[PDB]
Symmetry: D3
Subunit: 204 residues, 6 copies
């Protein structure tokens, strides 16, 4: 019946997105889905309304802000982004687990209005490795790198606010850790009593 909301946070260079993406390629829609943000920006090539984003007009957004329709929202680089409340609750009602990819700030807003939500934080395996991963292609000014490293340490500060902690050294290991958390939760008494209603009847 009721799905779980998983809040996933991480600094840039922990593989947070790659990881949530990998997990979805091996799991049906009736089991696990990615949360879909509302945004004001222009769709890019490939992007489709309903899948990558809920693309709406600057006006439609402000209506939604005023009628407290979002669970969290923020302005970024010139456009508005937020996670609809209605969108999340509908999916959960069908018994699907939802992955919400956000920063520590959105996290606390959701943990607030969604106290049943669980939260997972991903970290890099060392400072050196995080540096390396942040440097991406290796063609960036030392001043843009230090600003990215600063932003990362800011993110990582709120790590203790979270329910689970994954250290992402080996990608595969980290993906199994994520899969493990999902599976273990589905073995909680609450949901097993639901999923096995018929069987548990026959035995008793």
């Amino acid at each position: 019946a009721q799905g779980t909301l998983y809040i996933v946070s991480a600094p840039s260079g922990a593989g947070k997105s790659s990881l949530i993406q990998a997990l979805l390629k091996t799991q049906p829609l009736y089991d696990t889905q990615v949360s879909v943000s509302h945004t004001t920006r222009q769709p890019r090539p490939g992007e489709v309304h309903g899948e990558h984003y809920f693309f709406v007009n600057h006006d439609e957004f402000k209506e939604m802000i005023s009628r407290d329709a979002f669970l969290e929202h923020a302005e970024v680089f010139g456009n508005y982004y937020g996670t609809s409340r209605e969108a999340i609750e509908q999916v959960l009602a069908t018994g699907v687990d939802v992955f919400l990819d956000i920063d520590w700030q959105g996290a606390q807003q959701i943990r607030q209005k969604m106290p049943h939500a669980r939260s997972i934080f991903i970290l890099p395996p060392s400072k050196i490795e995080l540096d390396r991963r942040l440097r991406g292609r290796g063609q960036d000014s030392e001043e843009v790198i230090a600003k990215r490293m600063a932003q990362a340490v800011a993110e990582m500060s709120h790590y203790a606010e979270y329910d689970y902690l994954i250290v992402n050294d080996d990608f595969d290991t980290a993906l199994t850790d994520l899969k493990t958390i999902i599976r273990a939760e589905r073995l909680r008494m609450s949901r097993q009593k639901q999923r096995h209603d018929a069987l548990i009847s026959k035995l008793l």
Copy 2:
């Protein structure tokens, strides 16, 4: 530092003991095994094989202990498994089947529930729970103290 106490219950014919065994064969003593609290203080996870009675007594004086209940995949399969070798009086079977049903009644009192159909799958489920708990913030913060420092300054 601090380990977890796993209370494991199940009726006969669920595989409770065989399962806890198989799990101890691929896991070092510094990870999984008064006498209870000593081990837990060394950061080891303890598996306590008992019945619903013991369970409630331990849930009592050990409120931080987590509990796992194992069930047969059907009543037909439970019957079969209970019958063991197939050389038993039909009246000793029913007494075994009764005791099992009495056990299964208390399943809702537990934290986790494994349905043991495929033994391999059930063994993974058990491991999964173990791993998931070790990923909790409490325990990871402990185990990664040094790393977390380096990342923040």
Copy 3:
């Protein structure tokens, strides 16, 4: 030399097509392929002839129908849909395993003209779960749901007509079951005698 034909049937909500797709992403073309179906309809965005369907004319389709150029066919929602017999026997000749995704009807038609073909039936883990899976996104009329649930029961009735039965609870497990069946068949004497001809000579010196 000789490949196998795998008839896969299942009611909506068992994961039948997602399963067959997942299987194809981890298996080369010289080992496993899905049947491709001749259609008379329009190729939408992404859809190409050969890969997605074998898009043909209404006339070209109507010719094929006359000279028995089909393994199964009928009419759905406006157009014409059929599974070509020549296209099957060709791929099977090259030693490839073929997956034929259909309903219980085409199944009996094929079990007929392909008595050597094996059949796999996938089922949901319970009625409650079936209901839920069928309800898809959860924005559908109770009457359209009951019509789907009905159609599913009708399909499920024919289950015992099949060689293997997979209960699709955990998707991953179900996928391994599908693979296990595939692997086990290739372990049969018939095909192993073939595949290891060189080695079996040397040992029997």
Copy 4:
């Protein structure tokens, strides 16, 4: 309800015994067992009646041969060895799969009186590898090696009589091949119809 009887044959140097032992270490008794042979020979240290054999006296064995209670029996280096039909039938009745380890002679005898039994033949990956494995510890006379190799080729001749064929190159892969066979058989309509009776009702 009804389990399968698995006749397993192989030449020395294929890993036939190790394999079956490996399989039994990760499977409960209510699913898979090995067959236990009647014998007239003396139990060694560790060997127990009911586990490693069915140790009987010469006359008891003869009574049996007489009343056709065996599914096979031979005379080796001085003693008798047999497969009680009662012992096998009892276990299959409980729905357990049985693994019977024998030569090609026993195979045909059983194929005969047990037409529903399946047979698996394991082969070495090459004659060079077979030689090597047969040499065991590397301390044997060339005329004892040649007699074992001769015996091996004699055994491998009957390979075509079997249902499945496993090429044991990598031990782990071959063990998966064996496990694969078991699992695929359990997926047959015959046994699945049985195991999921309760569910198939509810669905209809």
Copy 5:
């Protein structure tokens, strides 16, 4: 700091490209990448510069040829294709492993000038199976087949020049073999000392 360059060769029919492809779907960019390769032809739809190819002028390409800016190159169905020395060294400097898919010829040129580089050769499990995979769809002239088989044998000749050897029987096993090599190399003392610098300090205080 230093990534390894993996030179991968195989005859047609070993699944060399499918293997490298499969490997990249389960591995992050900051761990493993495919070679770019500079070319002169037209950027089709979806095909970005930097990602799919390093597209350039027939002039810019001609300059690069003169000042030995390439690792290998030739002419194919009209245009110019080649992989650049600079493009490889840049990626390996960020600690990424690079997969270069080439023939024995380019292999030798690269063994020659490339520092941290290892080579892997893939082979079919038999001649009958190599035949079958080469026959592809099954609709080819016995003379085009003999020409593809001749080219294959020419390719398999140089197998002994290579560090590792994968026999591609079962595709999944073969992909595990490839993954195994990648992992083992990252367990070498050279790279582990690098990756675990902070940890090794603390242990040695």
Copy 6:
């Protein structure tokens, strides 16, 4: 064709359990443990050949003289050393050999066996090493410091080795050890050997 694996690690790295686990899932014609030579007394169950190569204090002295050992020392009275005859006999049969020793014996063996490869196992952190070293948690702080000192001495000849496994998760670590073995078996040298017959047919 075979390979000798030198495995070293400080106490609390899992070195023994790891080599033990590796042997249970692998046949004798593929992988074995090194049987070392000693002068002391055969305890109950301990068979010459299996557990040790037990020799007279004199036979051991002969063997030290004509440089028959790969490594040796004195321990709590007696003499312990690596029999190079025993090693070479096995490797000749194409079996990989595992040698559990300290950094001292290592160099002695890297010396007379330059083709042998070396693996070093480390604990995931100092805190975890401490905890693992504290075994049951009933030891004097001075017996703990003496073992932690002995570890750090052992843990500093690490660069001398070919491969480095960090044993955090026991299962991950065993996969690492298995990975190394497999990757070595995929070397051209040994693959030319094992697939000789196949490579002929291909180049027809």
